[PDB]
């Protein structure tokens, strides 16, 4: 689980959104696994505008923070899982790590803030749904 926290609004993965992310919807996109709703309190996360490669994702299944270079966004063929069927996945970045299922919501980072959230994984890769186009996310 996880969450990224910036302005009025909570970016989260589609699969693990709430009933009350649904009735309080800004933006869905099943082919990225996001869904960003609104929030009364303002957050405190900021994000990253850039394309940096490496950074550092947190990884609940081992309560670790591990760096990592990660592949640029793209359309990405992921298997099917208890959430999607097998299908492509976009602006999905992959490097090579830890993932569980539930690790998914866990925050990718570089030094100019977040990059994106953990989406997928399997066999020492994870794949985390990038944020750094959504340039809404910084304002109204
Ligand atoms: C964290 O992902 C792991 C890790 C290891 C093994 C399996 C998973 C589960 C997975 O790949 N999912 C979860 C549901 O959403 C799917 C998607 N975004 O297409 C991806
Ligand atoms: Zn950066």
């Not at 919807?25 to 994000?47: F, K, N, Y």
């Amino acid at each position: 689980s996880g969450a990224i926290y910036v302005g009025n609004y909570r970016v989260v993965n589609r699969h693990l959104a709430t009933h009350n992310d649904w009735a309080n919807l800004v933006w869905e996109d099943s082919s990225r696994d996001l869904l960003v709703s609104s929030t009364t309190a303002q957050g405190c996360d900021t994000i990253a505008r850039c394309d940096c490669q490496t950074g550092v994702y947190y990884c609940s299944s081992r309560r670790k923070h591990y760096p990592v270079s990660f592949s640029k966004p793209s359309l990405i063929f992921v298997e099917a899982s208890e959430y999607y069927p097998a299908r492509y996945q976009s602006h999905l970045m992959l490097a090579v790590g830890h993932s569980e299922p539930g690790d998914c919501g866990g925050i990718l980072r570089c030094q100019h803030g977040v990059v994106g959230i953990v989406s997928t994984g399997g066999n020492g890769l994870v794949g985390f749904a990038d944020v750094r186009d959504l340039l809404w996310l910084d304002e109204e």
